[PDB]
Amino acid sequence: MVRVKVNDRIVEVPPGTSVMDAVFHAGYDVPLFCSEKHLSPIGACRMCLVRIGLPIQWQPKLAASCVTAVADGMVVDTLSDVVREAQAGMVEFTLLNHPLDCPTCDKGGACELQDRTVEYGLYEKYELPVYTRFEFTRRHVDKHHPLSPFVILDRERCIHCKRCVRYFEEVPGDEVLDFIERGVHTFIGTMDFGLPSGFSGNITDICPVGALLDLTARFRARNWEMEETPTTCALCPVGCGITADTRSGELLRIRAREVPEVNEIWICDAGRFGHEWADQNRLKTPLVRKEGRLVEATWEEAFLALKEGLKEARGEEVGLYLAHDATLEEGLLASELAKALKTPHLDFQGRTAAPASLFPPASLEDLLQADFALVLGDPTEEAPILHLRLSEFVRDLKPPHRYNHGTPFADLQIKERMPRRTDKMALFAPYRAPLMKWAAIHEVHRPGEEREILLALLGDKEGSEMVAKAKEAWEKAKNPVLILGAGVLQDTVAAERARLLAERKGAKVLAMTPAANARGLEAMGVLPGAKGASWDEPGALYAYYGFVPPEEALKGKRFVVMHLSHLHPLAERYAHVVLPAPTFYEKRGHLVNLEGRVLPLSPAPIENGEAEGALQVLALLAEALGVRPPFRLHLEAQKALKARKVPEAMGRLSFRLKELRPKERKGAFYLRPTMWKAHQAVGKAQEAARAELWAHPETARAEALPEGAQVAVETPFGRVEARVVHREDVPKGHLYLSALGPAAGLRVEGRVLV
Amino acid sequence: MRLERVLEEARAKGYPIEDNGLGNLWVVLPRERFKEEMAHYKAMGFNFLADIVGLDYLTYPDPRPERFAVVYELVSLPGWKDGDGSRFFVRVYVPEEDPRLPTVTDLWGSANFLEREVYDLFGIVFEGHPDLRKILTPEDLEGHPLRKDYPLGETPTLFREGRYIIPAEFRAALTGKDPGLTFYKGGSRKGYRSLW
Amino acid sequence: YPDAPVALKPRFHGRHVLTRHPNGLEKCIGCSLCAAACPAYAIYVEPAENDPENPVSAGERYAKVYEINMLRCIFCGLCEEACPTGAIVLGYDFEMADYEYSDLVYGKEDMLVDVVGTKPQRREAKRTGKPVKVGYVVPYVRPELEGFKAPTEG
Amino acid sequence: ASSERELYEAWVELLSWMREYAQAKGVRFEKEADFPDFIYRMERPYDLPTTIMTASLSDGLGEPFLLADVSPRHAKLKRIGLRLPRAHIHLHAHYEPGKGLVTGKIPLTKERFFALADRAREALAFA
Amino acid sequence: EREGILFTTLEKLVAWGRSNSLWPATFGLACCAIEMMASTDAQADVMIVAGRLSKKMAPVMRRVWEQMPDPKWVISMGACASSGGMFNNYAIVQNVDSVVPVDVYVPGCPPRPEALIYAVMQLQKKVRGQAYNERGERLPPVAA
Ligand code: SF4
Ligand code: SF4
Ligand code: SF4
Ligand code: SF4
Ligand code: SF4
Ligand code: SF4
Ligand code: FES
Ligand SMILES: [Ca+2]
Ligand SMILES: [Mg+2]
Ligand SMILES: [Mg+2]
Ligand SMILES: [Mg+2]
């Protein structure tokens, strides 16, 4: 370790440290534009200049601290008149051509420039103070221009900190934004229009100013006027970290909360821009059926009408069915209830053929430290932030040393424009997968056809050249990790062989399950008993539902209770009691990560109407059926988790489970795992969560399916409308349907009506 | 004058002299030596006891000796006997898990009400005060309001259409231990002072 | 002496008025900065995007909702001071007690410059058909209150 | 001089041409920004013929193929400005007494303008 | 005959009566008490609450109110009585209405003497049963 003395304070610090993070670790501080966490540090804005001695021999020019490595016995001056005088000059030069919209700028009080300006600007040289020296025409250009349905660019505001272009190349890897002409005439611009990356929203959080701004939430409130709620996203298994911004019971904005242990400071687009549905159409009063129709009732008229439908009910026809995002608490109760209430009709909306708890959870940090990545499925669609890790991984970037201020602002490790390794990953997905670019060993197969590829990798059959190339690298692999998702976890045959491959070799796994809390709900024993009535198989006769199921699993049943948060058409025609429930943005409880971690879920001040959690509602269904529930409120339910011995927040719960409930898969339609979920198709995310049907140009046109045409598609999961797409990377005869749910990775009988 | 003889003494015996450039100066006595040496001050010629302030440092950015602290202010009125007009503060930190501190009601009469208030609003006991009874807060108030961990208790302000405001979540103002709305704060936002 | 008008000074702190420019646009660009400085948490501002064809104000931003809870307000003018446009400005009306609490949050239409009188005064002059009499006079109307038509024979 | 006044008299006129062309070739005209010296003029006086400082001719996607600005009231070295975005072409029109709106020496007429904007539309326009 | 022209037209008068027979029992606290002694200078029905109502002092105003002739009115003077005012904390009752039914609220801090005049002039049009709310309804002459 190197002995550096910042101002008067001396500090230890590892050799590969920036003079910046040196000075921030010490306590002291400095201006800061272009440089960002997890982005390659450069000296472009030229504000972090400091004075440096390497005796007392002071260097003749000022050094940009963000791109200078600490030498041993170094001295850093950040206070001298020389420094400050410069600092205030760098402020001055920035504001030189800046716009003057502060009051009317969505970049509220949350604006790095504003702030720094008042922190270091307006030097005190020792008569009226001179606010502005520049007195000429400013830089007028393109203003208030939407790049996407989600992003709005203000060219005038841009201060050229290279953050966004820099971010696009490095993190996701989609060069969709870059600078244009040179000199004082340069601006930000695109020729990829759509803003094609599925990680475009993150520029919104990096931009130091208000050029790049989240348009989902233009002109809602000022930054201090938001009621920030630090929680977790439950749209998929990665379980990131967000903060929900509200004001007056409505959902305004989604930003990312920093949580290095999981998603670093990044968030995927469906999670950040798909939130307008929880705002809007909502079930607020419990409905009960009267004249073959539903009408407004009370929890009174409901708790009674509910005793009535369950009075003559046998305690085995009782079916408990949670949603894919049921809190760890909501599941413990559904277990105990279904325990005391002797039944085998207990399932969760996402549950996969093969228990995700089959494979030993690998730390999201282990992926960085691994040697090879064997991947089956599309990490982009199933577990999006994994794409952003594999990016770091592929560059041999390994976990940063932590300083007093946390994650470094200037990691000399991340060099700009790092060359990516094609030899560290293998990819096998039923299409031209996004990341097949960073994997030389890549091949496109047919759906469910992975059960055979897995046999191959073990060593009991021959596979394509690639498959063998892969098997070869996995052998030589010192400490690989195994990433797998849909068809792998949705096919008894394959999944089982998988566990083997990674059981023989001492290697961990990342299971990209179609249920957000799959790994946690399984840990509570929220899987069905030997009977067979599972979340899509109509077996129950009297059952509870915490989501909307396939039409076929409700028919013939005697009593149906739908615990929704919105009124689905299927429910208003087949249900007998509808109870209002909260979105995940407004639930209090815990979750279990795809990597076996446990994350807190906080409740946002949104408009719940007259809704109650499944925590409560379940106990109400417990009375209506005999034995009183062991759980009431959340304060007490927490003791029952502390009794199963599930570690506190941020910890990891080891829990393996050996058993598998298979099922035959009727290959006609493949339900393609996607980032956007289907209930997100509202407002702006209106087209980005529209379904789409893929087919190979021959078979495509061989079954009357034009290029860009809407098309009625019928399925065991319901009747969706979608645009059709020609893709040569798709096997002939098969049709890939955009499965925008936890119904992803399935093979299903279906047709297309005309 | 009479304060010189105070400082020339504290220096000698391990008492820390705290000094802001602005015109006040403290002297922090330990727990025990407080009672007696505080009497020493009255005899020295300190007749007037101007104030007595309670401080809870719980939410203070930099660490301090113990969680609580009380400050006393001593004077020599310049219109009496010989009194020079020496003034200053004397402070003592006080354990959190043991809020007791001997009274000076023996020495100054003003210290009566003043000590009572420091006890109402912070939980600090005074060994031997005529009657440690609540002064300002209503009789049935549970706990001690002026300390950091006791809520201000604010109501959301109300407007039409169910538009409401929560003062807590609204304040653009920062709390010193507060990180700010952007990554970090620095420069004049960590403290500013001009050079007259 | 509700028969002889109260003579108030030009600086007097009355019911807020929201001024317009000559052009007829409102001065307020919905910045919620007034609301920010306010000790009482008495101002609520919802912003909206101007329509270029039919504009409310000169920015790209106007004030969709503007609301002041007078039962919270203290009349400190801290707000008029924070404002970058010269929009919100304390006025002269003081005659403004009323019956239902939530009737004391004024709105944009309640405080524009063109409006003469307070909620009560205008509401009673409604079911009455007798024009509003303001119970005051002033020497002159401030430079700041451009437009505000008030009884100021002086 | 009074040339400052006459400059703005022409700045409105340029705008008029722009709005004409925009409806005549059926393309987007956009107010890009109002003078800050007008939004923040409090009670202060103001007498410029309009309030628009940055104006543009954008296309189908909203990307500008022509830009136009004019120096604020309280600014030094005043000129009006024509810039064709992606093609690095900047222009500086001043105002001569008894001559007109000139670009160094050439009269910037309604004729000459339309040429520039048509040339720019055909070429630069993305959609 | 509760709602018959006989009884009706009767109480119309009685009301119009105790309308001009209003005897104000000011209950001043802080700064507002001083502004009103600038309006009174130039067995009671109708009490005026002027200032910050403390939580310790709250139960006191209750007794004073209760023991009172039965036809009565409460005026809520200034910002601290009308709601918590600018003191949104523990110490202070957020709206005197929290304790006693208010008939008229008067904004200001402290409201000008002549405001408090309009305040009672309004309380008049109210006990006459001649005052309406912004919703266009007719207000009950007394809170109870
Ligand atoms: S980007 Fe920052 S400095 Fe520029 S107008 Fe917006 S808030 Fe102000
Ligand atoms: S648009 Fe934002 S992130 Fe992109 S370079 Fe400009 S200021 Fe930096
Ligand atoms: S990756 Fe998953 S957890 Fe993270 S923001 Fe996107 S959908 Fe949500
Ligand atoms: S006068 Fe004072 S209390 Fe009233 S809105 Fe203005 S700033 Fe707030
Ligand atoms: S400070 Fe002025 S311009 Fe800003 S919102 Fe308030 S009144 Fe409108
Ligand atoms: S409303 Fe104002 S004048 Fe009246 S008591 Fe409260 S602070 Fe004093
Ligand atoms: S030069 Fe921009 S932060 Fe170092
Ligand atoms: Ca545009
Ligand atoms: Mg626009
Ligand atoms: Mg919304
Ligand atoms: Mg106590």
Q: What is the DSSP string of C71-113?
A: TT-----HHHHH-SSS-EE--S-----BSSGGGSEEEHHHHBT
CA dist., res. A418 & res. A40, Å (int): 9
CA dist., res. A502 & res. A481, Å (int): 8
Distance A88 CA to ligand 5 centre (A): 30
Q: Are residues A206 and A272 in the same domain?
A: no
Probe site for chain B from A124, A224, A409 (most B CB atoms < 10 A) = A224
CA distances from A56 to A15, A73, A668 (A): 21, 11, 77
Q: Which ligand is nearest to the CA of D61?
A: 8
| Chain-chain contact of C40 with B157 (C-beta, under 8 angstroms) | yes
| CB–CB contacts below 8 A, B to C | 26
Residues in contact with ligand 7 by the CB-under-6-Å rule are: A 32-35, 43-48, 64, 66
Q: Which residue carries 């979608």 as its tokens?
A: A722
CA dist., res. C75 & res. C14, Å (int): 7
Q: Which of A207, A213, A416 to mutate to test the pocket of ligand 2 (most atoms within 8 A of CB)?
A: A207
Tell me the β-bridge partners of A188. A179
**Half-sphere exposure of residue E137: CA atoms within 13 angstroms, side-chain side:** 8
Hey, how many other C-beta atoms are within 10 angstroms of the C-beta on E131?
23
Q: Are residues A236 and A157 in the same domain?
A: no
Number of H helices, E strands in chain B: 4, 7
Looking at the 3D structure of chain B, how many domains does it have?
A: 1
Q: Are residues A211 and A251 in the same domain?
A: no
Task: Give residue ranges of A with CB < 8 Å to any B CB.
Answer: 24, 29-30, 32, 108-112, 115-116, 118-120, 124, 126, 223-228, 248-249, 405, 409
Q: Which of A655, A738, A662 is nearest to A695 (CA)?
A: A738
Q: Which of A697, A684, A708 is nearest to A735 (CA)?
A: A697
- DSSP strand E in chain E: where? 27-28, 47-50, 74-77, 104-106
Cβ–ligand 3 distance for A685 under 6 Å, the answer no
Q: Which of A535, A575, A572 is nearest to A555 (CA)?
A: A575
Contacts of B139 in chain E (CB under 8 A): 56
Q: Which of A91, A6, A85 is nearest to A52 (CA)?
A: A6
Please name the chains neighbouring E, where neighbouring means 3+ C-beta pairs under 8 angstroms. Answer: B, C
Probe site for chain C from E48, E52, E80, E83 (most C CB atoms < 10 A) = E83
Q: Backbone phi, then psi, for A329, in 5-degree steps?
A: -80, -45
Q: Is A16 exposed, middle or buried (0-12, 13-18, 19+ CB in 10 A)?
A: middle
State both tokens at A252: 């305004």
Residue D33 is part of which domain span?
1-127
DSSP 8-state class, residue B70: E
Distance C86 CA to ligand 9 centre (A): 27
**Half-sphere exposure of residue A418: CA atoms within 13 angstroms, side-chain side:** 24
Task: Give the B window 143-182 contacts with E, CB below 8 Å.
Answer: 145, 151-155, 157, 167
Residue B104 is part of which domain span?
1-196
**Half-sphere exposure of residue A304: CA atoms within 13 angstroms, side-chain side:** 4
Q: Which of A317, A306, A232 is nearest to A618 (CA)?
A: A306
The DSSP string of chain C is -TTS-EE--TT---S-EE-B-TTS-BS-----HHHHH-TT--EEEEEEEPPSSS-SBSSSEEEEEEEEETTT-----HHHHH-SSS-EE--S-----BSSGGGSEEEHHHHBTT--S-HHHHHHTTTT------SEE-S---STTTT-------
Q: From A217, A248, A267, give the residue that closes a domain.
A: A217
Looking at the 3D structure of chain A, how many domains does it have?
A: 2
Tell me the β-bridge partners of D66. D57
B138, B141, B153: residue with CB nearest E89: B153
**A254 with A235: CB under 8 angstroms?**
no
Residues 6 or more apart whose CB falls under 8 angstroms from that of E8 comprise none
CA dist., res. D18 & res. D28, Å (int): 10
C41, C46, C65: residue with CB nearest B165: C41
Q: Are residues A211 and A317 in the same domain?
A: no
Please name the chains neighbouring C, where neighbouring means 3+ C-beta pairs under 8 angstroms. Answer: A, B, D, E
Cβ–ligand 5 distance for C111 under 6 Å, the answer no
State both tokens at C31: 């910045």
Stated resolution in angstroms: 3.1
| CB–CB contacts below 8 A, B to E | 21
Bridge-based pairing of strands D29-34 and C136-137 is: unpaired
Angle at the Cα of E129 (from E127 to E130), degrees rounded to 5? 115
CA dist., res. B175 & res. A435, Å (int): 46
CA distances from A154 to A204, A221, B24 (A): 12, 19, 52
Domains for chain E: give ranges and CATH numbers: 1-144 (3.40.50.12280)
**A188 with A175: CB under 8 angstroms?**
no
Cβ–ligand 4 distance for C82 under 6 Å, the answer no
| Chain-chain contact of A222 with C29 (C-beta, under 8 angstroms) | no
Residue A50 is part of which domain span?
1-217
Q: Are residues A181 and A257 in the same domain?
A: no
CA dist., res. A552 & res. A743, Å (int): 14
DSSP 8-state class, residue B100: B
The DSSP string of A284-308 is -S-EEESSSSEEE--HHHHHHHHHH
**A291 with A553: CB under 8 angstroms?**
no
State both tokens at C29: 């660009």
**A443 with A467: CB under 8 angstroms?**
yes
**E142 with E103: CB under 8 angstroms?**
yes
- Kindly report the CATH number assigned to the domain that includes residue D119: 3.30.920.80
- SS3 (DSSP) at A174: coil
Q: Are residues A199 and A237 in the same domain?
A: no
Q: Which of A325, A243, A215 is nearest to A605 (CA)?
A: A243
CA dist., res. A117 & res. A121, Å (int): 5
CA dist., res. C125 & res. C95, Å (int): 14
| Cα C107 to the center of its chain, rounded Å | 9
State both tokens at A367: 């992926």
Q: Which of A540, A537, A544, A538 is nearest to A560 (CA)?
A: A544
State both tokens at A658: 């050996």
Contacts of B63 in chain A (CB under 8 A): none
Residue type for position A66: C
Q: What is the SS3 assignment for A107-159?
A: CCCCCHHHHHHHHHCCCCCCCCCCCCCCCECCCCCCCCEECCCCEEECCCCCC
- Would the annotation count C88 as a binding residue? no
- Would the annotation count A48 as a binding residue? yes
CA dist., res. A590 & res. A329, Å (int): 7
Cβ–ligand 2 distance for A236 under 6 Å, the answer no
Residue with CA at minimum distance from ligand 4 atom 2: C76
| Chain-chain contact of C101 with E106 (C-beta, under 8 angstroms) | no
The DSSP string of E96-108 is GGGTS--SEEE-S
* Residue range C1-154, CATH number: 3.30.70.3270
Query: What atom in ligand 7 is closest to the CA of residue A35?
Result: 3
State both tokens at E109: 């801090």
Q: Decide if B156 touches A, using CB distance below 8 A.
A: no
Residues 6 or more apart whose CB falls under 8 angstroms from that of B22 comprise none
| Chain-chain contact of A146 with D62 (C-beta, under 8 angstroms) | yes
Residues 6 or more apart whose CB falls under 8 angstroms from that of A389 comprise A364, A367, A368
B139, B153, B167: residue with CB nearest E90: B153
Hey, how many other C-beta atoms are within 10 angstroms of the C-beta on A667?
15
| Chain-chain contact of E89 with B157 (C-beta, under 8 angstroms) | no
Angle at the Cα of A189 (from A185 to A193), degrees rounded to 5? 155
| Cα A750 to the center of its chain, rounded Å | 30
Q: Which of A8, A6, A30 is nearest to A17 (CA)?
A: A6
Residues 6 or more apart whose CB falls under 8 angstroms from that of A520 comprise A328, A331, A590, A591, A592, A593, A598
In chain C, where are the structural domains located? 1-154
Hey, how many other C-beta atoms are within 10 angstroms of the C-beta on A491?
26
Q: Which of A420, A421, A403, A400 is nearest to A412 (CA)?
A: A400
Cis ω on the peptide bond leading into residue A706 (within 30° of 0)?
Answer: no
Q: Which ligand is nearest to the CA of A282?
A: 10
Q: Is A593 exposed, middle or buried (0-12, 13-18, 19+ CB in 10 A)?
A: buried
**C59 with D39: CB under 8 angstroms?**
yes
State both tokens at A596: 């076996």
Looking at the 3D structure of chain D, how many domains does it have?
A: 1
| Chain-chain contact of B155 with E56 (C-beta, under 8 angstroms) | no
The DSSP string of A539-573 is --SEEEESS---GGGTTT-SEEEEEESS--TTHHH
Q: Is C105 exposed, middle or buried (0-12, 13-18, 19+ CB in 10 A)?
A: buried
CA dist., res. B63 & res. B70, Å (int): 16
Q: Decide if A219 touches D, using CB distance below 8 A.
A: no
| Chain-chain contact of C127 with E85 (C-beta, under 8 angstroms) | no
CA pseudo-torsion sign A113, A118, A122, A125: negative
Q: Which residue carries 């501002």 as its tokens?
A: C45
Residue type for position A479: N
| Chains B and C touching, counted as 3 or more CB pairs less than 8 Å apart | yes
